[PDB]
Amino acid sequence: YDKILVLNFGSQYFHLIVKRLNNIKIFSETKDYGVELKDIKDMNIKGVILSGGPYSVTEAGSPHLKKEVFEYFLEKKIPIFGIAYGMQEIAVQMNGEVKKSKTSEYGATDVNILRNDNINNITYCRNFGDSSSAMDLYSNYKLMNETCCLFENIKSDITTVWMNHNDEVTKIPENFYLVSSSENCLICSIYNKEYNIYGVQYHPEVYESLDGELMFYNFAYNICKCKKIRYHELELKNIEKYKHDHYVIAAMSGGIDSTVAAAYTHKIFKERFFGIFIDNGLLRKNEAENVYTFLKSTFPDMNITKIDASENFLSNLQGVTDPEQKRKIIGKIEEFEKAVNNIDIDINKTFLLQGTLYPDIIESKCSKNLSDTIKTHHNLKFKLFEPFKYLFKDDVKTLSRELNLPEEITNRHPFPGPGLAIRVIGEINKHKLNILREVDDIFINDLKQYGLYNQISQAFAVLLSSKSYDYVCVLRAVKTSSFMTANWYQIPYRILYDVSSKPPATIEF
């Protein structure tokens, strides 16, 4: 049977967490924080938690996990979860800055920071530095846009959680993300999506508090499907499809998710699917003349003639920015029902693929995003293939897996679905970027060979030419696992990087 364990740092309360992880019939027991690797390498553990309290980070000798073991754990693709001091130090292994909080956090106090949408709400935001406008937090630090897969099926934004810590965590780690920000302690959690490194300064503990409790249930089960694993395979050998009434179909935008989903749908046979939208020079400019060749050639007998956009017209449309009509185009994923199918395959009986992930279809199922859009049209009007729900973002970046796919395609960063219709305002033309011959790919080309993809995750272009008030184009980069975090990174210290406080500019301002 499966098992979740503890690497305990300072747990005067750990039988409650064994009570938790075991309320859910999953196996849990105690081990020292200096427990041998050779022991834990044999067994079916896909979760490890850390527990601690008000132990000082300033004076070493306080509990600590070594490197080779950190590498060991990050390589096996097992997610990491720390509680207060455990997360205090998951932020030190990966970064590290904990100064002195004259105040404490004790007992159960209301914590209410959970989304990328928090200005006037917070009352304690003026607890330091005379913050007349609470966009400062949103600027210097940012949360995972994708609302709440954490705390699934509930959103009580008031989490009144047990704590007892005099010292406070003061800084954000890499792949910056911030799940909570309390009253006295305006930082209360930090979680990275792809590595799924959770960290929470609040201690659930005794039974008078709720929300905190179910977190461990959906924790155990949603980080890892233990008792019932199915991480690939299941819904694939699951396609009747009678006669030539229908075969599989693929939606594309240049996707790792679908670089191998191709194969999942393929089954060879000369072929059985078709591609949809994206020869766009916008997407990998070199692969516009070479996009459909490579999409035919990574697996040789593949096929390619997706009806596809190439860039974005200028003032054919609005010569201004209308928040409704700026970007609202999918631009290129279904979009058309008529002759998207090159054979008069049956109207609805024909199947479909999409590169939509459980973390990517969840923007869809949930609240439609304010700032950022990847790939819309996401069942209905077609045929339910249900491949979404299979695995996550890092899981499908690794979906290249044993397919041992070319690494220069993984060094290139993903592309959503709008193009430079997102955050490019109004008219424009040829003397302007339409084949994405600026920002993004620039970075990409020296992200591969100078050595920056290892640390930096993504980058894009933002052009602004509605009048000539002014017509600029401004650069910036993002270090994101989840779908939003774009803070200032130290590239070895009139295009602009990050002179502004991050907002009032966004990933796509």
Numbering used by the authors: 6 to 233, 238 to 341, 344 to 389, 397 to 486, 496 to 520, 539 to 554
The study reports:
GMPS is made up of two domains, one being a glutaminase (GATase) domain that catalyzes the hydrolysis of the amino acid glutamine to glutamate and ammonia. Functional GMPS dimers associate through the dimerization domain.
Here, we present novel findings that add further insight into the functioning of this enzyme with a structure of a variant in which not only the catalytic Cys89 was mutated, but also Cys113, which was earlier shown to form a disulfide bridge with Cys377 in the PfGMPS_C89A/Gln complex. The crystal structure of this mutant solved by molecular replacement was determined to a 2.8 Å resolution. The electron density of this double mutant revealed a crystal structure that is not only more collapsed than the wild-type and single mutant enzymes described earlier but also significantly less structured, resulting in bad geometry, as can be observed from the Ramachandran parameters. The monomeric nature of the double mutant in solution was confirmed by Small Angle X-ray Scattering studies, as opposed to the solution dimers observed earlier for the PfGMPSwt and PfGMPS_C89A enzymes and confirmed herein. Unequivocally, the double mutant is no longer able to form this disulfide bridge, resulting in an enzyme that, in principle, can continue its rotation. Hence, mutation of Cys113 to an alanine precludes the enzyme from resting in a conformation in which ammonia is in the correct position for attacking the AMP-XMP intermediate, as observed earlier in the 85° rotated enzyme.
